[PDB]
Design a protein around this ligand. Sequence first.
Ligand SMILES: Nc1ncnc2c1ncn2[C@@H]1O[C@H](COP(=O)(O)O)[C@@H](O)[C@H]1O
Ligand SMILES: Nc1ncnc2c1ncn2[C@@H]1O[C@H](COP(=O)(O)O)[C@@H](O)[C@H]1O
Ligand SMILES: CC(C)C[C@H](N)C(=O)O
Ligand SMILES: CC(C)C[C@H](N)C(=O)O
Lengths: 910, 910
Amino acid sequence: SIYPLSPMQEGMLFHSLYTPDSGIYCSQTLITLEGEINLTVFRQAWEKVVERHSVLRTLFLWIVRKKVDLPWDYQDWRNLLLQTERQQGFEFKVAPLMRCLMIQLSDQTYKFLCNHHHIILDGWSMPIIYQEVLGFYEAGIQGKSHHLPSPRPYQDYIVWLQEQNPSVAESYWQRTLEGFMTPTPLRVDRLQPTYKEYNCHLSASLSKDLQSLAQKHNLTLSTLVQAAWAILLSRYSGESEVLFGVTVSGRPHDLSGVERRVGLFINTLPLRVSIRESDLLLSWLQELQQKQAEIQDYAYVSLAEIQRLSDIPPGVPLFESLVVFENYSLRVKDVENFEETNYPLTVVAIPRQELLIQLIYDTSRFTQDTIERMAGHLQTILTGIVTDPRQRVTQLPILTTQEQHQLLVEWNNTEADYPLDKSLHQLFEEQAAQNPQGIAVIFEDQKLTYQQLNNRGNQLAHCLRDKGVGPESLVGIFMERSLEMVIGLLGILKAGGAYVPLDPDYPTERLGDILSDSGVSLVLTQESLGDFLPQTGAESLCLDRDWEKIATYSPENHFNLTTPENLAYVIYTSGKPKGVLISHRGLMNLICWHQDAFEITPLDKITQLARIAFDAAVWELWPCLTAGASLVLVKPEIMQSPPDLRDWLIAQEITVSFLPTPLVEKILSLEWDENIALRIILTGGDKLHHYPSGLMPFKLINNYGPTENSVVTTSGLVRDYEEGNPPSPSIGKPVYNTKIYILDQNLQPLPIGVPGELHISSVGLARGYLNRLELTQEKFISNPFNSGILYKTGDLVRYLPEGNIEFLGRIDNQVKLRGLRIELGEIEAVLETHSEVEKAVVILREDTSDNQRLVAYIVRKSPSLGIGELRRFLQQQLPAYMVPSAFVILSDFPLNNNGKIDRKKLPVPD
Amino acid sequence: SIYPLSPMQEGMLFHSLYTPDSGIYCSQTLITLEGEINLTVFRQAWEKVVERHSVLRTLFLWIVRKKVDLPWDYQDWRNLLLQTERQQGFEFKVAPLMRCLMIQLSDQTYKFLCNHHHIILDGWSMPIIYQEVLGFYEAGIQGKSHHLPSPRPYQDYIVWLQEQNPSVAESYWQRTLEGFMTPTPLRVDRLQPTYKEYNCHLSASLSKDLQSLAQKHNLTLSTLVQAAWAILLSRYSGESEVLFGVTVSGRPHDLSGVERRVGLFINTLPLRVSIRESDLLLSWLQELQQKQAEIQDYAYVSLAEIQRLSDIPPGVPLFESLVVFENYSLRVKDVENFEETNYPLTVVAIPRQELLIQLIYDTSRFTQDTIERMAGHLQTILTGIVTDPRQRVTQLPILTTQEQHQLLVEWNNTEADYPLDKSLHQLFEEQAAQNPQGIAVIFEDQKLTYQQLNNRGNQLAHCLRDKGVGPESLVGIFMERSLEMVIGLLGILKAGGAYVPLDPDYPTERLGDILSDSGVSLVLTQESLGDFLPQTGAESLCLDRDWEKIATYSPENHFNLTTPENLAYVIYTSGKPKGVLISHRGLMNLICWHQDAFEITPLDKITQLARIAFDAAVWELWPCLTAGASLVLVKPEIMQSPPDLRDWLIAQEITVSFLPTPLVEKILSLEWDENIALRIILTGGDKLHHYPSGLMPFKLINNYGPTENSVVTTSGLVRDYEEGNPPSPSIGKPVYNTKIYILDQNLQPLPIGVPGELHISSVGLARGYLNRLELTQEKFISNPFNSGILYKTGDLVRYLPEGNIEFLGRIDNQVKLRGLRIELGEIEAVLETHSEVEKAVVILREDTSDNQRLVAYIVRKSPSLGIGELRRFLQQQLPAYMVPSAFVILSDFPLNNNGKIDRKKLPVPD
Ligand SMILES: Nc1ncnc2c1ncn2[C@@H]1O[C@H](COP(=O)(O)O)[C@@H](O)[C@H]1O
Ligand SMILES: Nc1ncnc2c1ncn2[C@@H]1O[C@H](COP(=O)(O)O)[C@@H](O)[C@H]1O
Ligand SMILES: CC(C)C[C@H](N)C(=O)O
Ligand SMILES: CC(C)C[C@H](N)C(=O)O
């Protein structure tokens, strides 16, 4: 009994000897017994166990451990809970004396409690000790012998350790963990210690089908469970490589297949699992079997040794999930109050006649609803595995029947009747029929009635159709926001053509490219701008100078000639920008949806401030003009001042107004008359950061959608912040005749809480890109879920629990194996909380392709705050690894031409 | 004049447009003119320059730049300094308008001021502009023409940039900077923005000899200067690879050899220089020539692009030193108030007829004395290079004649007469002659006079010499601190033998190894411990039981038989420990020095608390007994309580007391009677962290030395903290007959402020190690500076400015290319400043050989403080990269058996 400590034993000792009273290494176990007991023999049982297991009578000399053959257990007392309260709270004490480092107590209402230090025992070792203590009692409450083999002394683990070469195991852990730079994030967990148990019981049938499959193919039930969890983790995380804990014996020699012995050995090990698109479930399970066997050959270096030895940063865990397969005077419960640490999520497979799978979760990290669904997913995956193991791993189903249905069917039940026969201009002219005298457009003093607008529109149409314009014609429009411009738009539409906005402030070369791209032969403009057009060969008509030409022509409505498939407009998104071909159907849907959702009626006064090259302008003009309301063009002057715009909105008695996101953010800080005409403010285009105060008189509607889907895809009222609310307002839910899908990189559905790529199926979808047939086919695919078409948005989003969508960002800004476990927007929200921070954006890399170095751009309210005081504020709220290297104070955000924040113009730090 | 910005131009623009008014990019230049000036023509001169250089009339459109041929410079006014005060302070303003971004002003007392933005100009570009503006004035204050070629438009740099492939330059900067993980630290700089200039003028002879050498060997004067600085940096830094800035043209096409042109180009580039032990100066200079040429081929990516692209962490500079070779109505001065940034140290070679080398230094980072010496070093290196360029680079001299002398000769002038004929026991017995009745030893109640001790010593000697003991005999001593033990020690010495302390608390196996190592055939012990000796074959004598045997023998002094070369003691240092063979000469020197320095006289009462296996015990016993004083053995009880020991020291009227370092640290926090007998407290053994309060009644002496050099090498009084003081008390200066040397890894001398390895030349040096002849030869070498022997200590130290030595740590704990620019002890001192921190130790790696992760172990005063609040405190005081990843709260430091802090028993974090 002269032996050296294991490294793991030393570490532990030193930690205890020189850090203040800790109890990190104190494991308690508490046993509810009922019946009656021969106390005398129950004690002698414990003494029997203490007499046989050498560690249960070891002591430490301080670099050396001694087993003696002498000490045992002390009871303290026996004979309105009062146990937790004090009687269990008060243990900061163990001496490395011969006296077994294990103190016990039996009680009045019959409760046993065992305290011990991990320097002698393992999580594995306690079960063995109950079993052996119960068996020495039952064969001895009956004067018989409980015959058991003599155990190994655990002083021969120690010699075994020394026979092994640490450099072998260290090279192996280094080689195999190399690429792996941060822990697999579960991304179903909560922003910010009690644990709970969700029991997921598998049917007798599934249990048996699993066992069967294991036998047929030389796999174990533990491998099927780990596999199941590996598959689940890859879907939740988005990573095709995952890493979780598995529990192991850690005691070797192939006594893994015969014997059982007590002490401190390695009990958990990291298992790194990769899943490729070609992987089939049988082969991949064969492979998993090996890696789990293989890692056990290098089980003679601690996990702390393995953490540092990896590429994972110091300070952070290399996994947040653990899988344990418990291969194993009546007892009532064994409550384990080693609560001192536990992993956020541990999945415990207990292989009784039916397979139990317990999910033990940190309740600060996961909702009950999230965990229950996790249960459903494993259940789905396991049933899928036995049902057809020839299947590709990346295609195996995860959602339950009810989930599938809810997400893909019920939440997509947005079908709505709308006039699919009609066209934009028709609707308009019914509007101009029924209320000819109504103010249709207003610009400062100027004013058009529905008749003025219809008549002057019909004239330009007639002019235009003499010039060659019909269905599918693309006519340029190069004009300042004005009445002329509405007439222009309406003119092209009536001719049967489709308008191509040309922005008045564009350089002459970009205007060039648009005209050559779009192939327009005709551009409507105005004398002011005429000379800025490049000379491309195209005719230009001035609606100001040349109005005389146009006046000559009929102000009659013409025959309606366009079909819903005909192009209505072509608008560029941001190598070059790409023009999107929008048909009339799209717009009909939008208009009919919009008018319904926001109850637009001819009473309404509707603002028009988006520049005509952005598709928001479509959604300002046509719902309004086709409904009878009055469109108020806004001087861009007014828009330059949030408070002035506020006053101006109030002044002009505007009822419903679209404000782009950066602007609406600002007006929401202002204070507002309580009784104004403004009922709705619509916003969208960039990610809205801020919830409205309840003080706001209007209701605030968030909206989202690509240009490739007729302006709006998703819409939702935004209330004041509640509590269960995400860090930034939802983008709402799909609009009429729109279905959405949140999909993984192999086009597979994902459950609530998991981020994926938004795909859209809609009557709103573009015909495709102008002159980009390849890309049209890459992005507009055949829908896996219907006979209809699916557009890939490239936007990263997740379903919230009531069916709202959280917008996260762009799929291209995601990098594999550096997903941070905290969503960037979570930091943003936190930084924004501290007053003096008005707006924060957090980017991954503003530097180039070498490093990433996450930076945070802050716009301050006053100069009081600086990048140090901020830094400590964020390491107070989050930990580190969740705090950026650089913080850049800005004065204002680089906005692109439409209002969206311009990333590539953000200043790179230092 | 349609052109895209350079990347470097864009970055700059964005930074200006969206960060709050900054003036980071504002360069000012201020020109003292005297004489009289045709104001009218001076202006027109500037207009001439503005008319020719395209950037001097460029504007920015916001991704595009425009040159116009129209704007120029405005004067604002003209006609008790008041300029700095306001008139120069107030510039936060430049608009990217056609109006040249360059505002000027001429003044009353004749001062010109030019403000411009780096988005148009370079540090290189301003000189060209003065020259061209002065030349258009002088040929025009005389109605003549100043004829100059027409410049390149700098719109063809931009096309050149675009013709180049960034991936080529990026691969090159990545490949060549790879190993290089932190900036070359100068380690002559100060712990913690004004600049100063030290002019270092080289003689006409040296200037010319350099130029000559350049011609002979196809090198330039710039390469000789960079070389010089590279050599200096490697010595200061301790790194055989260095990295500094060099300035470059950045404008290419081989117009580097003809033309001169204005704009913004790359001006600084990182030059990585390696120096190997075999390198010869000619070949190595040839090579340096190439690398400096080569790097200029990749001069089309910014330095910010090169920083991130390197292995240097984000946030930190990749060099703190820059070398610029300025190859280039009278003007008085050009004062450059672009002070907005400058590097901590820039070395400017100005190649006028004699070579000037300016050292421009941040005065918060370097003392005037440090810089002057730097000047002397370059001067030394350059003179060395011309004198013999066949020389090895690592052997070239750096110290001046006076420095060499001061460090190696004058500060080592410690020769002292001492009785080299005599031996320890002789001196003793003269002491026991002259004052037979004096109390020699005291232990609680027990007491020996000089006669008791001498007589009982002579008896044991006679006993011993019948048992075979003589010169060179090693006798074991295995005894509790007691009177018997002093008698034992004194007995062995008189017999002519040398004692080998065996520690009473050692395990029987370590005792075994010592006895087999030392080969003792005889061990003096005591009945108490006899049975703990292992049975090795050696005789044991009990000075307690067997005293009767010993009493029979003569109490006469014997003939003195030992010579000063004879062994006196053998003591192990901490694979296995190694026994050190100390002779009598060593001890004579120590005793005679000690008695002189601390004025020991027979009045003195001297404490004895070091365990006998530590060599401190030698330095407690023999100075005292050989002087006539009374040695008080201390109960180790008393030593367990700082306050009790204090009281006990005061109580017993002890005059001079050795307390090991961890203990003295603690007593210095106590409060102290002002009038006590205690005059000196001696300490040493570990690094003392704390300076005494002035309130302390005694004086506190720090001391240092390896066992291999008779206990003490260096000694120095420690006062209260002053200001210029290092973070922890000096270890003083060499003792009698001791010379020290602070040397680099090629055994070369180093100047003040530079850390190196301490080597000792002394009469105190061990004969060598017991039974380790190899190691004796590796560590005890032939002295490069005398005919005498040199011991390599493995300790890292530096000379302070008055000749004190700062102890830094162990050479083995240093790792190349991760030296931090801040000394660990600097952090320690800072952490210690904050009350609630009683003691802090900062280690490099407590984890294993994969990462390093610098950790800090803190002992707190009360539990109030925690590892977060500490963390922010240290990122407040230092920046980051100077703050550890882990902080471990301890309760107490793992001490080894002698008092030194035990590193390998520090708890590894997490
Ligand atoms: N409400 C919104 N919240 C967040 N991002 C949005 C929102 N609306 C639009 N987007 C983003 O803006 C894009 C539309 O850009 P484009 O169609 O090119 O003008 C979408 O694909 C999203 O990435
Ligand atoms: N005063 C001191 N300050 C700092 N380190 C010290 C001091 N005295 C001794 N040392 C260290 O202790 C060593 C002596 O250890 P040893 O001779 O083996 O007992 C030296 O080589 C130093 O590294
Ligand atoms: C949802 C709307 C605000 C328009 C959206 N920004 C788009 O780019 O189509
Ligand atoms: C300088 C003295 C305190 C002794 C020193 N610690 C040594 O190890 O020799």
